[PDB]
Each structure stands twice: as C-alpha cells, then as structure tokens.
Design a protein around this ligand. Structure first.
Ligand SMILES: CCCCCCc1ccccc1CCCCC(=O)N[C@H](CO)COP(=O)(O)O
Lengths: 222, 290, 54, 338, 232
C-alpha cells in the first residue's frame, strides 16, 4: 500500500537511529560502584572530575559512566542482575574502620561488615567474569590510627608490626583472598592517593587492562 | 616456442631430476613418514572442526578463523596424501595436466595455511588494539578475510597451472619443479617472506603495546611464551623451504635438490602442529575434548 | 514496635471475618467458565490460517 | 505488651488456617480427573521482533491485540506493530534502568519505570508527533517493579519499598498507598473489573487489595521463596503466582486457598513471568530455563513448551483476544507465538 | 503547529520560481510532506511528496521531471523548485504534512498555501453533486464513487475526506472510512465499502458550510475528486 510503504520507511528510519545510538553507547565505559556508608565513595566521586545516581566524565580521549547504586536501600538479590556485564566493579572500603563498630549491630566491626559485602559480590553468580577494582580509602587516617592503636582488635591473627607499610599490606591481602574465581577475575587494588589524583588514572589503566586482557580472553590468545 | 607435446620424461631429463622407475630405501621411508604426517594432519583437524562446530560457545570470529585453519590444514593433508601415491615409480604414470594438478593442490593448500596464520595475526592485532569492553562483533570482517584467504589461495595455486610456467621457456625455469619458472618461485617465496615479516611485526606490536600499558600498572610470561612458539613453528618450518627455493632461482651450483623431499615434509609438519598450537592455550576448548 | 503489632492484629481479624465458600463449588465454577468459553479460545483449539492474523 | 499482641496475633493466624482446612472439601485435581486433556499444544514462532540492543525486562500488549511495548537496558521504549513487525515509536528514556511497562487501555499513554524510583508516563497522541513525557510519578523510595493503568488518569504501581500505590496522573500524587507487605513487591495484576488487584512480594506472600478503600482484603501464602509474577484468571475469581520455588500456584479469592501447584521434577530454575489463556485453560509461565512452558491450568500437566530464546524469558504476555502469545527475553528478541 | 509557505505571485511563462514552506511548532524531521494545488475555479490536485528523511520522492503526471522538491530538516523548511511554468500551473499551492504509522492520520494539517498566477492506471474519484442546497439542523449525506476497489487486502479502505470552508485551507474530517479526525465534532461520519462511499452529517451549522473533497490513498498519484459545495 502507499501508506504501508511509507510505513516501512519509518521502521527503517527508526532502525538507523537505533544503530547510531547502539554504537555510541558501546564506546562509553560502564563502572558499578558499591561500598559502606562512610566508605569514601563520595570522596572518589569528587576526584573523578535519590535512586541510582549516574556521573559522566571523559579522560584521555575515553568516556566513563559511574553508577553509584548504593542509595537503593532495597534487596540486592532482585536488582543486581541488571548490572551484569558492566566493565568493572569499583568497590570502596575505609581502612580506618578496623577499630569502630556499627552503632546498630552489637559487635560486628565495620571492617568485618565490609568484607561480608565484598565476599558476596566478588563471588556473585552474576559477576563471574567481571573484574573488580578495589579502592581502599582513608589510608591517611589509617596511618595515624595505626600509630596509636593495634590492628589485633579486628583481626585476632597478625604476624606483623604496627607499621603502615606492613599494617596496610596485611589488610589488602586479607581482602584479596576472598575470591574463589582466582583464575577468572583480577582484583586491582589501589590505595587512595590524595595529591596526584591518579585514582582516575589507575582506573583508566585498570579498565584498558580489563579490556585488553579481556580481549585476550575471548580471543583465546591467553 | 611452446611444447606440451613431450611427456614427463622429457621434462625431468631436461632438469637435473631422476624419474626413479624402481622403489628405494629413501622412497619407502618418505612414503611411511608422509602417510603418517597426512593421517596426523587429517585426524587432528577433524577433531578441531568438530569441537568448533558442536559448541555454540565457539561461534565467534576468532574461533571461525581457527576452524578455517583446521579446514586449510586438512586440505594440505589431502594434497600431501595425494602427492604420495604419486611419487617414486608412481610419478612415471603422470602426464603434464595431472602433474600440474598435483603441484597446484600443494600450492593452494600451503598458501591457504600461510594466509590463515596471517589473518589470525591481523585479527588478534585488531581485537587487542580496540578500546572498549564489549564491542558487539559482527560476522563481516571474519567472512571478508575468509574469502580474501581462499581467493588468494586459489589464484596462487592456479596461476602456474595456466599461464605462469615454463611450457614456453624451457631454458629459463626451476631445477626442482621442472615446469614452474624462476619468476614464480621468487614470487611465491617473496610472498611467504613478506607474510612472515608481517606476522613478526604484528605480534611484536601486540607485545609492545600490552607491555607498555599493563606494565604502567602473570600475563607477560603467557604472552611471550605464546608469541615465541607461534612464530617459531613458522620460522623452523618455513625458513628451510624459502631459502632452498631462493637458492634454486638465484645461486649457481647450489646443490639444492638433495634436501627437497624432506623440506617439503617439514612444511607439511607445520600444518601438522598448527591445530595444537592454536588449541593448547584455550583451556575451555582444549578440555571440550571428551 | 507496639503500634505495628496493634495494626497487625486487626488486619487478620478483618481477614478471618469474611464469608468462605466450599472449594467443591468453587472448583465447579472454574470448570464451568473454561468449558463455557472453550470454543472461543484460539490457543486451546487451533484456528485455520484464514482466520489467523499471524 | 509485645508478647500479649504476638501470642494474640499467632492465634489470629490459626482461625484463618483452621477455617481454610474446613473449606478444603476436595482437591481441584480430584474434581478435574475426568476432564478430557488439552492435547499436545504445538505453538510456533510466527513473528520475531528485532531492534533491542540489550536484555528486555518488560512488554505489554494493546487492548486492540495488535500493538505492543517493550523496554530494555539500552534505554529505549519501543512500540511494536505485531502484524507487520515494523516499529511505530522508539522512545528514549531519561533512565536506562527500566524494569516495567504498561500500555494504557485507551492506547493514548505508555508508562515505564525502574531503579530511578520514578514512573514516567509518555503521551502517544501528541499534536507535534513526537512522544513526549507527560508526568513523572516520584513518590516511591525503591525500584518500581510493576505498573498497570486503570484509566488514562489512574495508574497503580508496586515498588521495592514494600508498598504499592494508586496514583492520579494529573496531580502526580498518590491517591492511595497500599502497605502491609513485609518484603519487596515484585508484580501486580488488576482484576478484569479494575476494582481489585493482587500483588506478589519477595516475602513469599500475595495480597488481594481494594483499589477504592486501600485496605488488603486477603493474604495468600504457600510459596517458599520470592513471587516474581502474578495474573488473574479471566473471570477475576482466581489468580496464579510464579515464584523462585520453580512452582506456579493457582489461588482462589472466594475460597481463599491454594488449588494447584504446577511443579515438575525436571524444573529447578525460577519462574520470571506468568500469563493465562483467554479461556483460562492454559497457564503460560516463562522460566529461567531459557524456555517457556504451557501448563494445563485444570489438570496440572505440562502440555507444550516454547523454546526459542537464547537467554531467560523475562516477560510473557497474551493478547486480549488470545490470538497470540509474545515472549521477551534477555537475548534482545521478542517472539510472537501462535 | 502553523505551516506557512513563501513565494508565488506573478511569473511570466517559462520562468523558474521556488516555493519555501517554513514549518514551525512540530517535529518537522519525522513528517512526510506533500504539495497540493487548487486551481482558481477547480478542485484540488496532488503534485509532489517527500517521505521522512528524503527517502522517497514522488510526482504527478503533469509535473513529472518538471518540479524538484526538497526539505531542509535542520531549518524546518520545505522547498519546491519549479521549472518552465506552463499556463496550466496557475493554482494555490497548499503544503500538507502527513505521518504514516499504524493508526496515524495523514493529511491532518494543511498550510495556508501561496497564490501563483503565471502570465499569459490512475484511480478516478467521481462525485456528481455540486452546490447542493441544505438548511441548518437538517441531515445531509454526500456520496462518492471510485473507479477501483479501495478496500485493500488488510481491510483498510484508503479513502479520505476534507472540508474547505470559504476562504480557508482544507481541513481533514475522515482519514479512513468509519474513522473521525482530531478536533472535528462527532456530527461528521462516513460509511462505505469498495467503490461506494457516503459522508453523513447529522446536524450542521453556519460554521461547516463549504465545499467537500474526496481523496483516495490506495496508490499514487493520490487523485482527488471534484468539489461538493453545500449551499446556504
Ligand atoms: C612448486 C613450488 C611451490 C612452492 C614451494 C613448495 C615447496 C616447499 C618446500 C619444499 C619443496 C617444495 C616444492 C618442491 C617440488 C614438489 C615436490 O614434490 N618435490 C619432490 C622433492 O623430492 C619431488 O616430488 P616427485 O618428483 O617425487 O613427484
């Protein structure tokens, strides 16, 4: 029909718009963030330039989209699957939470609570192949905190001196051991660096590596 | 002056070559080793193609070129298998047309194998150098390069079968292939030489890029191991043949006929090793073997 | 938590104070409606391609 | 005291449970023992709609049984023409995280929502011929899981804040708020007469609500895990729930009990969508098995399967006239089965 | 949502003049545009058409290869390039918008058109009623006849209706048989099948007196009918 003929011209005009848009979305980078209330996710976001909040930034000729979804306060078991296949999962924990506790629970240290969230995400059935970037914040306050208090409060076992060098290191590693997908996904842990702000550059590099390494994975050249 | 009048005997006798009407120790040995190599190539490629087709997981462009390499090497196995059952006394049963058929099969099969290796190299360079995570990959550039490979393979195996041979210039042509011309052997060997140097530059660029970017931040060991073993198979299976052919066409008094039957067996052994070089690393596909 | 409990108890008391019919009769009613509209169902009885919009 | 009311409250559950046994005269499976079976239901993919570049979560038929809507994480809302497979509208969303769709009964409006906690309403019939967003219903504190238009002005929504709401689109305020769910609400279904609606929540219970009063009339339990989909029987005197226990259950509103469970030993993944047939004889349930089963709704015998999708079947809807069944999935394709 | 066109006036024969129609107030990039001309004493006559995004350009028999039609989406304008005007091109050139999708209403909005006075296998729709006398508050029926079965296979009778009040642009009433346009009272109604069509007005007023037109859209070049003026 003359009308129906113009109709299939609309469906072709629609499809052009869908393609151009599809391939524009592809070049943008999709990072999911999680963490504790006092983690420093806020501090990370500042460095980078209700509902699910999205933030857009460009760096070294590449476009990044960070999804702060910590404000959902519902059940993650129903809505996390929506993020399956994000480039990488930024995760923030505050190193100065080793000696505190949640004011609501009895004696679950904040640090032990942070691990519990990290355990469930690093081994989540939906992110088997997804890499994790792990930011550890409040490293500065942790230096001054560890100079006065012991670390043994939170971790009973510690074959180590109360020096930042060793103190931090044990924790990092203690977090990194959580993953049973050792031979699938890479955790690139970095300590939040105040002045250089290269937290952004680490992610840039960590993503390209996640990409280049991933390119290596599907292509079996690895 | 062109003559397809004469038989194979005239062409051999014009060359330095010997017909070998009688069986030989050497002939029996090479028949056994060639049939072994051919059986190995055929079996190994059947498994690779069967696995690449049975799993819907291996339905992506890299695995497409992998299955294409398995098919090309199976074609090479068949060509070398047919070249056998036609050597020693059996060659005396040949004619000009049939001899050209045999040599053409060999040319197109090996050219296809070399082109598949170059194509896989070019693909890995592209996949590594893209700067996105997912990039929904189409089936366009894989099928484009699959037809380039096969077009080039068929044109290269047919050119001497038609026009580029010494049916017209008896004086000016090869010592090993009595009918292929020095021009054709130079061309085939410079083609393979530039293809090898292209594979060398591409994998070196891959290594350099990955090194710079990831070291700015173990992968280094695996990448260097894989790169070295991929180029090594090619160099230790081709440098012999290529240098031997250049010697035939350039060097006077270079007795190059003596280690010919073996260098071709080495070049077929390349295609023997290819399905396992390109399937050992992929834990998943390798294990799929059950 | 006293308010939540008080709002809770009157909810079930309202829920318990409803007329309930036997499953015997309600079973027949679901049987009756399916058979009464059986012959108007495209998916139950497949329709020839002449009256099939797809 | 807390214990006084609690020891009281646990008693009130007893009279409800005591009366339900007294009304359990005979099982539907015993009553429908002599009904002639439905026979093998061979249903083939007639149309396949392509154009989504991400996983589909939601679709809704039109009341004219020809047009339909779909949303995906690509941040596009597409109105399809099922007959000619051609796109009528492609609506860009402000939020890529969309989990629900509704197509108004008049077909003048379409609504979508998700993790952005907002129900956006798009106007289709617009003088300037470009679907424009009409209203943004922002009164929830959790992801929206479902939404169903009553009229061009009334829309009822269920969210992850354990509450359902009835809205007034002109004013953009909740006319009524339905509370009482102890878990995240996943789906709602409106009655044929649009006077009642049942909602399924993550607390393994379904509640019958009254749209005018705003109070819960009945609550049905029996499932073991989250209830992910819900639909009334065509007569509005029954409804079916799909859960993560890989069971579908047919509840009655008058008898206030459970009638059937549609469980098969082979099936171990969770039900994502359920829908009925125009006669109520077939219950189509979209599982995570990547396929979709068709149940005999009065025999509880799996008669028919619709296996055409690569990934999980997210949404599954049947037309008003029952001439087709369309299933969406995470493989980015809608398929029309007839 | 107004449409205004520019150009026209007085041109000697053989001259080439350009008509520009500046769309304003609607999504011009997604509207298929037409041109329809009306002779000073005669009825409407379709001339040109462009689809959305300049994908499809059609023409009438009398202007094939003589007219060039173009659209400028970013500037929301429509152009017509006329070449070697003949004496039979004296007409008011309306500009019409139309969008084609399931259930849409093509030819819903008509421009004011421009006056152009040059110095000096096709469906035919037939209605033999003109200057019909009628009184306000009575019921009047307007009949139309086609030379071809407009009822397509899918069941769409691509017959349209229009109403041109004296000194105004044409206005859509019925975009397909048994359908009613937007912003038109319920009084207008149309029932017909195949080649026989009627337009029934239950009760009329001084506002809807004027000339009525019938158009088919089964296939190009969208031949119109003669006028049917209501006398009052
Ligand atoms: C035709 C050139 C294409 C390019 C070179 C292929 C190649 C590579 C590496 C070693 C050798 C070659 C071919 C050499 C001739 C082909 C043969 O079969 N020779 C043997 C040598 O003993 C006699 O075969 P025959 O006379 O017994 O039939």
């Amino acid at each position: 029909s003359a009308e129906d003929k113009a109709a299939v011209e609309r469906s072709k005009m629609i499809d052009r718009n869908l393609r151009e848009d599809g391939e524009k979305a592809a070049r943008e980078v999709k990072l999911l963030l999680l963490g504790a209330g006092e983690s420093g996710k806020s501090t990370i976001v500042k460095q980078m330039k209700t509902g699910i909040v999205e933030t857009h930034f460009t760096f070294k000729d590449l476009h990044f989209k960070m999804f702060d979804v910590g404000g959902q306060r519902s059940e993650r078991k129903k809505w996390i699957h929506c993020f399956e296949g994000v480039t990488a999962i930024i995760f923030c924990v505050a190193l100065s939470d080793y000696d505190l506790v949640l004011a609501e629970d009895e004696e679950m240290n904040r640090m032990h609570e942070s691990m519990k969230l990290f355990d469930s995400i690093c081994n989540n059935k939906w992110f088997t192949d997804t890499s994790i970037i792990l930011f550890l914040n409040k490293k500065d306050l942790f230096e001054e905190k560890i100079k006065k208090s012991p670390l043994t409060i939170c971790y009973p076992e510690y074959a180590g001196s109360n020096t930042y060098e060793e103190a931090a290191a044990y924790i990092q590693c203690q977090f990194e051991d959580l993953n049973k997908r050792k031979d699938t996904k890479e955790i690139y842990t970095h300590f939040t660096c105040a002045t250089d702000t290269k937290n952004v550059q680490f992610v840039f590099d960590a993503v390209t590596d996640v990409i280049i390494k991933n390119n290596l994975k599907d292509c079996g050249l690895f | 002056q062109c003559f397809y009048n004469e038989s194979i005997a005239f062409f051999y006798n014009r060359s330095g070559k010997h017909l070998a009407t009688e069986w030989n120790t050497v002939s029996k040995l090479v028949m056994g080793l060639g049939i072994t190599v051919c059986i190995f190539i055929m079996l190994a490629n059947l498994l690779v193609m069967v696995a690449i087709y049975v799993n819907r997981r291996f339905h992506f462009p890299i695995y497409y070129l992998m299955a294409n390499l398995a098919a090309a090497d199976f074609f090479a196995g068949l060509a070398y298998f047919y070249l056998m059952f036609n050597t020693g006394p059996n060659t005396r049963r040949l004619t000009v047309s049939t001899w050209l058929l045999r040599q053409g099969l060999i040319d197109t099969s090996l050219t296809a194998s070399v082109a598949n290796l170059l194509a896989i190299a070019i693909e890995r360079h592209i996949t590594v150098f893209r700067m996105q995570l997912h990039t929904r990959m189409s089936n366009r550039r894989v099928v484009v390069v699959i037809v380039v490979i096969w077009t080039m393979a068929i044109v290269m195996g047919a050119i001497p079968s038609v026009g580029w041979n010494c049916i017209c210039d008896i004086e000016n042509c090869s010592n090993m292939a009595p009918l292929y011309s020095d021009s054709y052997l130079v061309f085939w060997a410079i083609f393979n030489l530039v293809t090898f140097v292209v594979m060398v530059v591409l994998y070196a660029h891959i290594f350099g890029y990955v090194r710079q970017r990831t070291m700015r931040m173990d992968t280094m060991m695996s990448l260097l191991k894989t790169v070295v073993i991929v180029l090594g198979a090619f160099i230790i299976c081709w440098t012999p043949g290529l240098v031997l052919l250049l010697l035939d066409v350039c060097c006077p008094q270079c007795d190059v006929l003596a280690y010919e039957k073996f260098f071709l067996l080495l070049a077929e052994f390349n295609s023997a090793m290819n399905p396992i070089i390109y399937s050992y690393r992929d834990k998943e596909m390798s294990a799929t073997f059950r | 938590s006293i308010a939540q409990a008080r709002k809770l108890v009157e909810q079930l008391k309202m829920e318990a104070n409803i007329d309930r019919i036997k499953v015997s009769k309600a079973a027949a009613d679901l049987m009756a409606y399916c058979e009464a509209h059986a012959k108007e169902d495209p998916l139950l009885t497949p329709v020839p391609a002449s009256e099939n919009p797809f | 005291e807390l214990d006084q009311l609690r020891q009281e409250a646990e008693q009130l559950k007893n009279q409800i449970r005591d009366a339900r046994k007294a009304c359990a005269d005979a099982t539907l499976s015993q009553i429908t023992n002599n009904i002639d079976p439905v026979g093998r239901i061979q249903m083939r993919t007639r149309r396949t709609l392509r154009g989504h570049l991400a996983k589909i979560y939601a679709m809704h038929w039109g009341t004219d049984s020809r047009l339909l809507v779909s949303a995906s994480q690509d941040g596009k809302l597409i109105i399809w023409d099922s007959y000619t497979t051609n796109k009528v509208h492609a609506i860009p969303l402000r939020s890529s995280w969309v989990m629900t769709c509704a197509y108004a009964p008049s077909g003048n409006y379409v609504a979508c929502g998700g993790l952005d906690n907002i129900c956006s309403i798009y106007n289709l019939k617009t003088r300037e011929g470009n679907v424009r967003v009409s209203r943004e219903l922002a009164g929830h504190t959790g992801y929206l899981s479902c939404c169903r238009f009553l009229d061009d002005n009334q829309i009822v929504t269920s969210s992850g804040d354990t509450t359902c709401a009835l809205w007034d689109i002109e004013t953009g305020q909740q006319t009524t708020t339905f509370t009482g769910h102890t878990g995240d609400v996943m789906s709602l279904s409106l009655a044929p007469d649009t006077r009642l609606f049942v909602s399924g929540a993550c607390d393994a219970s379904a509640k019958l609500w009254d749209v005018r009063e705003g109070m819960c009339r009945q609550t049905f339990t029996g499932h073991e895990s989250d209830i992910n989909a819900i639909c009334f029987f065509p007569n509005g005197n029954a409804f079916a729930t799909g859960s993560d226990d890989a069971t579908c259950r047919l509840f009655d509103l008058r008898a206030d009990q459970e009638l059937m469970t549609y469980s098969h030993d082979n099936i171990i993944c969770g039900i994502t969508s359920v829908s009925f047939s125009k006669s109520g004889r077939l219950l189509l349930a979209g599982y995570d098995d990547f396929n979709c089963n068709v149940w005999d709704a009065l025999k509880a015998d799996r008669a028919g399967v619709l296996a055409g999708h690569d990934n999980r079947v997210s949404c599954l809807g049947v037309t008003d006239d029952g001439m087709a069944v369309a299933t969406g999935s995470w493989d980015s394709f809608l398929k029309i089965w007839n | 949502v107004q449409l205004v066109e520019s150009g026209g006036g007085l041109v000697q024969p053989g001259g080439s003049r350009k008509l520009s129609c500046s769309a304003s107030g609607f999504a011009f990039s997604s509207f298929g545009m037409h041109w329809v001309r009306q002779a000073p004493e005669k009825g409407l006559e379709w001339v040109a058409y462009i689809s959305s995004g300049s994908g499809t350009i059609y023409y009438a028999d009398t202007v094939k290869g003589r007219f060039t039609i173009s659209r400028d989406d970013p500037k929301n304008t429509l152009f017509l390039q006329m070449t070697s005007l003949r004496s039979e091109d004296t007409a008011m050139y309306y500009c019409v918008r139309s969008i084609y999708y399931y259930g849409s209403s093509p030819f819903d909005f008509w421009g004011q058109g421009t006056t152009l006075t040059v110095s000096s296998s096709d469906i035919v729709m037939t209605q033999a009623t003109s200057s019909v006398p009628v009184t306000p508050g009575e019921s009047v029926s307007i009949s139309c006849r086609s030379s071809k079965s407009l009822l397509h296979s899918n069941g769409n009778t691509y017959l349209y209706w229009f109403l041109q009040r004296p000194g105004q642009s044409p206005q859509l009433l019925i975009y397909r048989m048994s359908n009613l346009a937007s912003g038109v009272p319920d009084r207008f109604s149309g029932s017909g099948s195949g080649t026989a069509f009627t337009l029934t007005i239950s009760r009329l007023e001084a506002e809807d007196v004027g000339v009525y037109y019938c158009m088919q859209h089964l296939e190009y070049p969208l031949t119109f009918g003669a006028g049917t003026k209501l006398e009052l």
